[model samples]
Target: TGCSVTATRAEEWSDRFNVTYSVSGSSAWTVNLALNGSQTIQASWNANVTGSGSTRTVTPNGSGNTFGVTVMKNGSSTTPAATCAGS
Candidate 1:
């Protein structure tokens, strides 16, 4: 199973963002976006829910409240696929 959102970076978004960027396991499944810092919000099934928010206005501003996401490659809870953020 999996899901997706069209956008997290708002129309008027302007901020410095980057992903530490790393992934692991068997080699298949999952992805998401709009994440910063260290905070695992999902795994295995809905694996695209990582976050550790900061100040921005695309969705909101705060910790654990900011938009977060991930993705899981079919049939694999562990893989080398990878993820990132928006805005």
Candidate 2:
């Protein structure tokens, strides 16, 4: 069988922050984000023998006066997966 994932960015006050995501049944997965100023970030994780795992990391960029970052999972046509609070 196969699985799908998603993510979204949240309000931010700083220029950078760490974000994390996970899945229930997948051998491997990837996380990506489309930030302001025409920039993008992507990450991937490999699952063990088990059917569960997670991925985590920090995202840095020049948001300038942006409110938040938008993240999304690969192969998933859903909306933003998660939002990271920033300031």
Candidate 3:
């Protein structure tokens, strides 16, 4: 159905990001990750504990805050699986 994503930090100077994901109905899903149109990856979810290994990274260079991540169901974007804006 859908999924929930959370980004958390455990300590300063830690390079890795703790990203947690939960799918509605515990359905299989895909995560479309893009940064600055310069980088990307599509992640599949199984489950989580502590966190998924994502979310913390450098912002787009020069271009600024326009870069954001998106998540969706494996076969449909019309029925997107993602968090509501400003949550």
The best candidate in terms of lDDT: 2
Instruction: Report the C-alpha lDDT of model 2 over 1-87, residue by residue, as the tens digit.
Output: 544333433333243332333333432333333233322333322311111124233232322212233333333322333323232
TM-score of candidate 3 to 2 decimals:
0.26
Ten residues in a row with the worst lDDT in model 1? 9-18
Best model number under TM-score: 2
After superposition, candidate 3 runs with Cα above 4 Å error: 14-18, 36-87
Against the hidden reference, what TM-scores do the models get? 0.21, 0.28, 0.26
Ranking by TM-score: 2, 3, 1
Residue clash pairs of candidate 3? 19-52
Model 2 stretches with alpha carbons more than 4 Å out = 6-13, 30-32, 40-87
* lDDT of the structure predicted as candidate 1: 0.29
Model 1, runs deviating above 4 Å: 1-14, 34-87
Of models 2 and 3, which has the larger TM-score?
Answer: 2
Q: Name the lDDT value of residue 22 in candidate 3.
A: 34
Window of ten residues with lowest summed lDDT in model 2 = 44-53
Ranking by lDDT: 2, 1, 3
